[PDB]
Amino acid sequence: VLAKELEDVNKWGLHVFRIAELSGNRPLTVIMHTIFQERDLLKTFKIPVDTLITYLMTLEDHYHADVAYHNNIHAADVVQSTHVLLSTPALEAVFTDLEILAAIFASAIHDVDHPGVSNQFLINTNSELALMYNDSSVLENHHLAVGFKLLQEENCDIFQNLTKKQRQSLRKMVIDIVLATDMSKHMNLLADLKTMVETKKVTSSGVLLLDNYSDRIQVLQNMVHCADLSNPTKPLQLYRQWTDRIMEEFFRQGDRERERGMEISPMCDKHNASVEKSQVGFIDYIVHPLWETWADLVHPDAQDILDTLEDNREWYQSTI
Numbered sequence: 268v269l270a271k272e273l274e275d276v277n278k279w280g281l282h283v284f285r286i287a288e289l290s291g292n293r294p295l296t297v298i299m300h301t302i303f304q305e306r307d308l309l310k311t312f313k314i315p316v317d318t319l320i321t322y323l324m325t326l327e328d329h330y331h332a333d334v335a336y337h338n339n340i341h342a343a344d345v346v347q348s349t350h351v352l353l354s355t356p357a358l359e360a361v362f363t364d365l366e367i368l369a370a371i372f373a374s375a376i377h378d379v380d381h382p383g384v385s386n387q388f389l390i391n392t393n394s395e396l397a398l399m400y401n402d403s404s405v406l407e408n409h410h411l412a413v414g415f416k417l418l419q420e421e422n423c424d425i426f427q428n429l430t431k432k433q434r435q436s437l438r439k440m441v442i443d444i445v446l447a448t449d450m451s452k453h454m455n456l457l458a459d460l461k462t463m464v465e466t467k468k469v470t471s472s473g474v475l476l477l478d479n480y481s482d483r484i485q486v487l488q489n490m491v492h493c494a495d496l497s498n499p500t501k502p503l504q505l506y507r508q509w510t511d512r513i514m515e516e517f518f519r520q521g522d523r524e525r526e527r528g529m530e531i532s533p534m535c536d537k538h539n540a541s542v543e544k545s546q547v548g549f550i551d552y553i554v555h556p557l558w559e560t561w562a563d564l565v566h567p568d569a570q571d572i573l574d575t576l577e578d579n580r581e582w583y584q585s586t587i
């Protein structure tokens with residue numbers, strides 16, 4: 268049954284919540300294991316199967332089960348979504364196995380040990396995290412720090428058989444990718460992606476042409492960023508449960524902010540919320556400009572995804 272559901276791993280709108288239930292709250296381990304097998308990454312990179320499972324289970328453990336959105340289910344969802352975006356025809360044979368590995372690894376660790384509050388909340392409450400990271404991409408630096416540190420636990424180094432050059436290069440790409448998931452960088456990341464689409468070059472086979480590191484990492488950065496912002500592009504029954512979860516986490520932060528005499532962050536005030544209006548807002552100003560730009564990059568590969576996003580936007584609008 269779980270094996271049956273894991274057959275949809277190459278499809279957008281995989282039912283990740285059912286996989287979480289059917290796997291005993293291990294969506295991240297089973298989805299990553301499935302993907303690594305499907306891409307033959309264990310053979311390519313000589314990853315012992317027991318090492319892979321041991322690391323995935325430790326990594327999954329360090330997502331908070333009592334955080335409603337930023338948990339191991341979100342992590343599995345972003346992994347799988349990145350996996351599908353990597354298979355788009357316009358990117359066929361563009362990225363190396365190592366780059367593919369970096370973007371999937373980055374997706375899996377990208378929110379680990381997220382405590383359920385935003386960077387700004389952690390800065391304004393003079394948290395230990397904000398003090399360690401000097402108010403700059405506080406959460407994103409921590410996700411990386413944890414995701415790499417766990418590689419050193421007993422039988423957890425899934426990269427043990429990479430060359431030195433391979434390890435160095437993967438590490439840098441993973442850092443570059445996860446630091447780009449910081450929402451405060453969205454505008455500059457989208458602005459760069461627009462520029463790339465406007466000067467887009469394709470090869471004789473129709474595939475996207477990426478000459479240099481800068482272009483290659485920027486596509487992988489925006490790819491994982493799109494995967495991170497992909498809830499509104501999924502089938503509505505999935506999207507709605509992500510909205511429920513984000514609003515619970517947001518409202519909880521807002522209660523803490525109220526208790527402390529702070530101003531409540533946008534969308535965190537449960538006595539003054541408009542869930543539907545905000546999803547429409549967020550899609551119109553953030554999610555759709557990004558996905559429309561990605562759709563242009565990989566035209567027409569992403570047309571169904573963009574269509575689903577436009578329907579979901581219409582549906583949320585219709586309930587106001």
Ligand SMILES: COc1c(OCc2ccc(F)cc2)cc2oc3cc4c(c(OC/C=C/C(=O)O)c3c(=O)c2c1CC=C(C)C)C=CC(C)(C)O4
Nearest residue numbers: 385450451495496498499509510513533534545548549552
């Ligand atoms: C403060 O800005 C805002 C903001 O401002 C208020 C506003 C902005 C524009 C607008 F039009 C309406 C409201 C509203 C926001 O609304 C969201 C809605 C969401 C989700 C969000 O998370 C994205 C994933 C995060 C992760 O995986 O970590 C976000 C945001 O992150 C967000 C941010 C960004 C955060 C910053 C700058 C710190 C996730 C799932 C769905 C789509 C179901 O719902």
Ligand SMILES: [Mg+2]
Nearest residue numbers: 377378406448
């Ligand atoms: Mg994050």
Ligand SMILES: [Zn+2]
Nearest residue numbers: 341377378495
């Ligand atoms: Zn995330």
